[PDB]
PDB file of all heavy atoms in Angstrom:
ATOM      1  N   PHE A   1       1.265  14.686   3.123  1.00 26.88           N
ATOM      2  CA  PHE A   1       0.261  14.875   4.184  1.00 26.88           C
ATOM      3  C   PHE A   1      -0.226  13.554   4.729  1.00 26.88           C
ATOM      4  O   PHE A   1       0.069  12.434   4.145  1.00 26.88           O
ATOM      5  CB  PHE A   1      -1.000  15.546   3.576  1.00 26.88           C
ATOM      6  CG  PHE A   1      -1.527  14.964   2.287  1.00 26.88           C
ATOM      7  CD1 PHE A   1      -2.488  13.986   2.364  1.00 26.88           C
ATOM      8  CD2 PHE A   1      -0.993  15.324   1.043  1.00 26.88           C
ATOM      9  CE1 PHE A   1      -3.109  13.461   1.178  1.00 26.88           C
ATOM     10  CE2 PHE A   1      -1.534  14.801  -0.108  1.00 26.88           C
ATOM     11  CZ  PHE A   1      -2.526  13.865  -0.099  1.00 26.88           C
ATOM     12  N   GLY A   2      -0.707  13.521   5.979  1.00 28.80           N
ATOM     13  CA  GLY A   2      -1.136  12.351   6.639  1.00 28.80           C
ATOM     14  C   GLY A   2      -1.260  12.563   8.145  1.00 28.80           C
ATOM     15  O   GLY A   2      -1.695  13.665   8.592  1.00 28.80           O
ATOM     16  N   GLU A   3      -0.936  11.633   8.957  1.00 30.64           N
ATOM     17  CA  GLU A   3      -0.763  11.701  10.419  1.00 30.64           C
ATOM     18  C   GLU A   3       0.562  11.389  10.951  1.00 30.64           C
ATOM     19  O   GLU A   3       1.200  10.400  10.556  1.00 30.64           O
ATOM     20  CB  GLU A   3      -1.801  10.826  11.120  1.00 30.64           C
ATOM     21  CG  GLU A   3      -1.629  10.834  12.677  1.00 30.64           C
ATOM     22  CD  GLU A   3      -2.530   9.800  13.317  1.00 30.64           C
ATOM     23  OE1 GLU A   3      -3.625   9.517  12.828  1.00 30.64           O
ATOM     24  OE2 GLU A   3      -2.078   9.221  14.369  1.00 30.64           O
ATOM     25  N   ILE A   4       1.007  12.205  11.870  1.00 31.38           N
ATOM     26  CA  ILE A   4       2.046  11.776  12.851  1.00 31.38           C
ATOM     27  C   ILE A   4       1.553  12.219  14.268  1.00 31.38           C
ATOM     28  O   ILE A   4       1.076  13.353  14.443  1.00 31.38           O
ATOM     29  CB  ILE A   4       3.379  12.373  12.622  1.00 31.38           C
ATOM     30  CG1 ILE A   4       3.782  12.142  11.170  1.00 31.38           C
ATOM     31  CG2 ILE A   4       4.448  11.940  13.580  1.00 31.38           C
ATOM     32  CD1 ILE A   4       4.760  13.182  10.525  1.00 31.38           C
ATOM     33  N   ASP A   5       1.662  11.288  15.281  1.00 27.96           N
ATOM     34  CA  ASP A   5       1.238  11.602  16.629  1.00 27.96           C
ATOM     35  C   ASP A   5      -0.108  12.185  16.774  1.00 27.96           C
ATOM     36  O   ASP A   5      -0.407  13.240  17.455  1.00 27.96           O
ATOM     37  CB  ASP A   5       2.263  12.619  17.336  1.00 27.96           C
ATOM     38  CG  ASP A   5       3.727  12.283  17.135  1.00 27.96           C
ATOM     39  OD1 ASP A   5       4.002  11.049  17.050  1.00 27.96           O
ATOM     40  OD2 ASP A   5       4.562  13.155  17.026  1.00 27.96           O
ATOM     41  N   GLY A   6      -1.126  11.471  16.153  1.00 25.87           N
ATOM     42  CA  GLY A   6      -2.475  11.986  16.145  1.00 25.87           C
ATOM     43  C   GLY A   6      -2.682  13.205  15.211  1.00 25.87           C
ATOM     44  O   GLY A   6      -3.693  13.343  14.561  1.00 25.87           O
ATOM     45  N   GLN A   7      -1.673  14.163  15.205  1.00 26.39           N
ATOM     46  CA  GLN A   7      -1.800  15.383  14.504  1.00 26.39           C
ATOM     47  C   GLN A   7      -1.729  15.167  12.984  1.00 26.39           C
ATOM     48  O   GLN A   7      -0.920  14.504  12.468  1.00 26.39           O
ATOM     49  CB  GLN A   7      -0.644  16.310  14.908  1.00 26.39           C
ATOM     50  CG  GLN A   7      -0.942  17.809  14.929  1.00 26.39           C
ATOM     51  CD  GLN A   7      -1.288  18.368  16.270  1.00 26.39           C
ATOM     52  OE1 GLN A   7      -0.388  18.373  17.126  1.00 26.39           O
ATOM     53  NE2 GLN A   7      -2.524  18.868  16.520  1.00 26.39           N
ATOM     54  N   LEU A   8      -2.714  15.860  12.331  1.00 24.94           N
ATOM     55  CA  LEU A   8      -2.771  15.829  10.881  1.00 24.94           C
ATOM     56  C   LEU A   8      -1.890  16.981  10.308  1.00 24.94           C
ATOM     57  O   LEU A   8      -2.173  18.100  10.724  1.00 24.94           O
ATOM     58  CB  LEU A   8      -4.289  15.854  10.362  1.00 24.94           C
ATOM     59  CG  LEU A   8      -5.108  14.567  10.642  1.00 24.94           C
ATOM     60  CD1 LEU A   8      -6.399  14.604   9.815  1.00 24.94           C
ATOM     61  CD2 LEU A   8      -4.379  13.321  10.521  1.00 24.94           C
ATOM     62  N   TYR A   9      -1.137  16.679   9.323  1.00 22.15           N
ATOM     63  CA  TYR A   9      -0.221  17.564   8.780  1.00 22.15           C
ATOM     64  C   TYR A   9      -0.286  17.726   7.227  1.00 22.15           C
ATOM     65  O   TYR A   9      -0.792  16.830   6.538  1.00 22.15           O
ATOM     66  CB  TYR A   9       1.246  17.225   9.163  1.00 22.15           C
ATOM     67  CG  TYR A   9       1.832  16.039   8.456  1.00 22.15           C
ATOM     68  CD1 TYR A   9       2.733  16.241   7.426  1.00 22.15           C
ATOM     69  CD2 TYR A   9       1.520  14.728   8.790  1.00 22.15           C
ATOM     70  CE1 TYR A   9       3.293  15.195   6.715  1.00 22.15           C
ATOM     71  CE2 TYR A   9       2.017  13.651   8.041  1.00 22.15           C
ATOM     72  CZ  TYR A   9       2.911  13.860   7.012  1.00 22.15           C
ATOM     73  OH  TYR A   9       3.524  12.877   6.306  1.00 22.15           O
ATOM     74  N   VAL A  10       0.062  18.938   6.777  1.00 20.60           N
ATOM     75  CA  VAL A  10       0.305  19.130   5.321  1.00 20.60           C
ATOM     76  C   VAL A  10       1.682  19.771   5.123  1.00 20.60           C
ATOM     77  O   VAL A  10       1.846  20.883   5.552  1.00 20.60           O
ATOM     78  CB  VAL A  10      -0.828  19.950   4.648  1.00 20.60           C
ATOM     79  CG1 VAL A  10      -0.448  20.212   3.232  1.00 20.60           C
ATOM     80  CG2 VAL A  10      -2.160  19.248   4.772  1.00 20.60           C
ATOM     81  N   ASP A  11       2.535  19.150   4.406  1.00 20.52           N
ATOM     82  CA  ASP A  11       3.927  19.631   4.123  1.00 20.52           C
ATOM     83  C   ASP A  11       3.925  20.223   2.703  1.00 20.52           C
ATOM     84  O   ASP A  11       3.542  19.596   1.751  1.00 20.52           O
ATOM     85  CB  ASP A  11       4.858  18.446   4.152  1.00 20.52           C
ATOM     86  CG  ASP A  11       6.190  18.782   3.536  1.00 20.52           C
ATOM     87  OD1 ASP A  11       6.355  19.765   2.864  1.00 20.52           O
ATOM     88  OD2 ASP A  11       7.108  17.936   3.703  1.00 20.52           O
ATOM     89  N   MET A  12       4.313  21.482   2.620  1.00 21.94           N
ATOM     90  CA  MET A  12       4.266  22.197   1.358  1.00 21.94           C
ATOM     91  C   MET A  12       5.527  22.986   1.123  1.00 21.94           C
ATOM     92  O   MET A  12       6.354  23.285   2.165  1.00 21.94           O
ATOM     93  CB  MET A  12       3.092  23.165   1.271  1.00 21.94           C
ATOM     94  CG  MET A  12       2.640  23.637   2.596  1.00 21.94           C
ATOM     95  SD  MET A  12       1.148  24.823   2.465  1.00 21.94           S
ATOM     96  CE  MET A  12      -0.310  23.486   2.795  1.00 21.94           C
ATOM     97  N   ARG A  13       5.791  23.314  -0.149  1.00 23.36           N
ATOM     98  CA  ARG A  13       6.894  24.140  -0.572  1.00 23.36           C
ATOM     99  C   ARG A  13       6.864  25.562   0.065  1.00 23.36           C
ATOM    100  O   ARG A  13       5.784  26.264   0.272  1.00 23.36           O
ATOM    101  CB  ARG A  13       6.786  24.314  -2.116  1.00 23.36           C
ATOM    102  CG  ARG A  13       7.964  25.168  -2.828  1.00 23.36           C
ATOM    103  CD  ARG A  13       8.417  24.275  -3.985  1.00 23.36           C
ATOM    104  NE  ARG A  13       8.666  25.032  -5.199  1.00 23.36           N
ATOM    105  CZ  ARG A  13       9.113  24.514  -6.337  1.00 23.36           C
ATOM    106  NH1 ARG A  13       9.521  23.216  -6.357  1.00 23.36           N
ATOM    107  NH2 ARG A  13       9.377  25.244  -7.451  1.00 23.36           N
ATOM    108  N   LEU A  14       8.054  25.967   0.584  1.00 25.33           N
ATOM    109  CA  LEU A  14       8.029  27.357   1.286  1.00 25.33           C
ATOM    110  C   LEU A  14       8.327  28.425   0.331  1.00 25.33           C
ATOM    111  O   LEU A  14       9.258  28.387  -0.491  1.00 25.33           O
ATOM    112  CB  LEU A  14       9.320  27.294   2.292  1.00 25.33           C
ATOM    113  CG  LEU A  14       9.640  28.696   2.806  1.00 25.33           C
ATOM    114  CD1 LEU A  14       8.906  29.014   4.121  1.00 25.33           C
ATOM    115  CD2 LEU A  14      11.111  28.877   2.861  1.00 25.33           C
ATOM    116  N   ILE A  15       7.544  29.490   0.421  1.00 25.73           N
ATOM    117  CA  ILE A  15       7.640  30.615  -0.483  1.00 25.73           C
ATOM    118  C   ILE A  15       8.021  31.927   0.231  1.00 25.73           C
ATOM    119  O   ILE A  15       7.478  32.145   1.245  1.00 25.73           O
ATOM    120  CB  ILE A  15       6.393  30.795  -1.371  1.00 25.73           C
ATOM    121  CG1 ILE A  15       6.244  29.573  -2.288  1.00 25.73           C
ATOM    122  CG2 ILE A  15       6.527  32.051  -2.178  1.00 25.73           C
ATOM    123  CD1 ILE A  15       7.513  29.173  -3.109  1.00 25.73           C
ATOM    124  N   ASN A  16       8.879  32.681  -0.391  1.00 27.25           N
ATOM    125  CA  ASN A  16       9.211  34.046   0.079  1.00 27.25           C
ATOM    126  C   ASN A  16       8.399  35.099  -0.644  1.00 27.25           C
ATOM    127  O   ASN A  16       7.763  34.823  -1.717  1.00 27.25           O
ATOM    128  CB  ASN A  16      10.633  34.251  -0.286  1.00 27.25           C
ATOM    129  CG  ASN A  16      11.649  33.687   0.745  1.00 27.25           C
ATOM    130  OD1 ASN A  16      11.551  32.538   1.198  1.00 27.25           O
ATOM    131  ND2 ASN A  16      12.563  34.593   1.167  1.00 27.25           N
ATOM    132  N   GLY A  17       8.318  36.261  -0.061  1.00 25.31           N
ATOM    133  CA  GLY A  17       7.549  37.358  -0.672  1.00 25.31           C
ATOM    134  C   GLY A  17       6.712  38.081   0.277  1.00 25.31           C
ATOM    135  O   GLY A  17       6.768  37.796   1.507  1.00 25.31           O
ATOM    136  N   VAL A  18       5.863  39.027  -0.209  1.00 24.31           N
ATOM    137  CA  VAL A  18       5.001  39.807   0.607  1.00 24.31           C
ATOM    138  C   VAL A  18       3.557  39.620   0.110  1.00 24.31           C
ATOM    139  O   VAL A  18       3.317  39.403  -1.021  1.00 24.31           O
ATOM    140  CB  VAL A  18       5.406  41.271   0.607  1.00 24.31           C
ATOM    141  CG1 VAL A  18       6.661  41.515   1.373  1.00 24.31           C
ATOM    142  CG2 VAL A  18       5.626  41.831  -0.820  1.00 24.31           C
ATOM    143  N   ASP A  19       2.631  39.898   1.062  1.00 24.78           N
ATOM    144  CA  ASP A  19       1.156  40.002   0.793  1.00 24.78           C
ATOM    145  C   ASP A  19       0.930  41.122  -0.211  1.00 24.78           C
ATOM    146  O   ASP A  19       1.651  42.138  -0.078  1.00 24.78           O
ATOM    147  CB  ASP A  19       0.396  40.428   1.934  1.00 24.78           C
ATOM    148  CG  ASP A  19       0.421  39.541   3.112  1.00 24.78           C
ATOM    149  OD1 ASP A  19       1.289  38.599   3.107  1.00 24.78           O
ATOM    150  OD2 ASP A  19      -0.269  39.625   4.078  1.00 24.78           O
ATOM    151  N   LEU A  20      -0.091  40.928  -1.040  1.00 26.47           N
ATOM    152  CA  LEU A  20      -0.550  42.056  -1.850  1.00 26.47           C
ATOM    153  C   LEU A  20      -1.068  43.111  -0.840  1.00 26.47           C
ATOM    154  O   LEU A  20      -0.825  44.331  -1.024  1.00 26.47           O
ATOM    155  CB  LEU A  20      -1.664  41.547  -2.767  1.00 26.47           C
ATOM    156  CG  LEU A  20      -2.261  42.510  -3.776  1.00 26.47           C
ATOM    157  CD1 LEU A  20      -1.222  43.186  -4.561  1.00 26.47           C
ATOM    158  CD2 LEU A  20      -3.242  41.783  -4.630  1.00 26.47           C
ATOM    159  N   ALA A  21      -1.748  42.653   0.252  1.00 26.11           N
ATOM    160  CA  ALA A  21      -2.082  43.552   1.368  1.00 26.11           C
ATOM    161  C   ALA A  21      -0.860  44.350   1.908  1.00 26.11           C
ATOM    162  O   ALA A  21      -1.007  45.538   2.059  1.00 26.11           O
ATOM    163  CB  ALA A  21      -2.738  42.741   2.482  1.00 26.11           C
ATOM    164  N   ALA A  22       0.279  43.628   2.114  1.00 20.80           N
ATOM    165  CA  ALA A  22       1.447  44.418   2.500  1.00 20.80           C
ATOM    166  C   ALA A  22       2.014  45.283   1.470  1.00 20.80           C
ATOM    167  O   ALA A  22       2.333  46.402   1.810  1.00 20.80           O
ATOM    168  CB  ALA A  22       2.491  43.354   2.921  1.00 20.80           C
ATOM    169  N   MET A  23       2.079  44.910   0.213  1.00 25.10           N
ATOM    170  CA  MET A  23       2.450  45.771  -0.844  1.00 25.10           C
ATOM    171  C   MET A  23       1.649  47.021  -0.911  1.00 25.10           C
ATOM    172  O   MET A  23       2.189  48.107  -0.784  1.00 25.10           O
ATOM    173  CB  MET A  23       2.275  45.077  -2.210  1.00 25.10           C
ATOM    174  CG  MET A  23       3.089  43.829  -2.519  1.00 25.10           C
ATOM    175  SD  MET A  23       3.551  43.677  -4.371  1.00 25.10           S
ATOM    176  CE  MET A  23       1.845  43.647  -5.244  1.00 25.10           C
ATOM    177  N   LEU A  24       0.333  46.917  -1.010  1.00 25.66           N
ATOM    178  CA  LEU A  24      -0.551  48.074  -1.184  1.00 25.66           C
ATOM    179  C   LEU A  24      -0.338  49.083  -0.155  1.00 25.66           C
ATOM    180  O   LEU A  24      -0.146  50.328  -0.461  1.00 25.66           O
ATOM    181  CB  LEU A  24      -1.991  47.659  -1.312  1.00 25.66           C
ATOM    182  CG  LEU A  24      -2.359  46.849  -2.495  1.00 25.66           C
ATOM    183  CD1 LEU A  24      -3.582  45.958  -2.359  1.00 25.66           C
ATOM    184  CD2 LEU A  24      -2.463  47.688  -3.724  1.00 25.66           C
TER     185      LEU A  24
END
């Protein structure tokens, strides 16, 4: 995380799957 081009970013691990909302 930090700044590039003024924009503040957070880079995180990508996860697959469905919402519990979607499941139900």
Side-chain angles (χ1 to χ4, degrees):
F1 51 93
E3 171 190 329
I4 305 153
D5 310 329
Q7 213 101 62
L8 295 196
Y9 75 102
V10 176
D11 163 353
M12 34 181 88
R13 186 129 137 178
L14 166 97
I15 295 308
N16 275 51
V18 289
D19 300 13
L20 187 52
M23 297 212 304
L24 291 155

